[PDB]
DNA sequence: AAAAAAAGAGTTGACACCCGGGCGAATCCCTGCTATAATGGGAGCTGTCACGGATGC
């Protein structure tokens, strides 16, 4: 989309966000984010950063 | 110089017949009635644009 939003449409139907189709499958919750973006650890407010 | 008849008309009975209207008979169309248990549906694009307009917050 022009707004940088992924839109999925099945059989040229009304456009809806791909997050709905992803949640329809087994992958739910933060599993869709853990598989797309990597996570980096950080300290729990130590000296400085 | 005269004077009556095959056609031309006109009918008068004498069949030949040809669809019409009935009498039949033979046969079509409608309608309903069947009693174990039946319980939500199958394609179709999706390889043209572009314009010109109609809804919505």
For every residue of A1-46, DSSP letters joined together read -TTS--EE-STT---EEHHHHHHHSS--TTHHHHTTS------SS-
Token digits for A34?
């853990």
A12 CB-to-strand B distance under 7 Å:
yes
Nucleotide nearest to A12 (CA to C1'): B46
Resolution for the entry shown, Å: 3.7
Start-to-end CA span in chain A (Å)? 37
In whole angstroms, what is the distance from residue A33 CA to residue A26 CA?
Answer: 14
A30 CB-to-strand B distance under 7 Å:
no
Nucleotide nearest to A11 (CA to C1'): B46
């Amino acid at each position: 989309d022009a707004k940088d939003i992924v839109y999925v449409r099945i059989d040229r139907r009304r456009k809806l966000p791909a997050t709905t189709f992803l949640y329809a499958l087994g992958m739910d919750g933060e599993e869709i984010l853990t598989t797309f973006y990597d996570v980096v650890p950080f300290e729990k407010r130590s000296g400085g950063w």
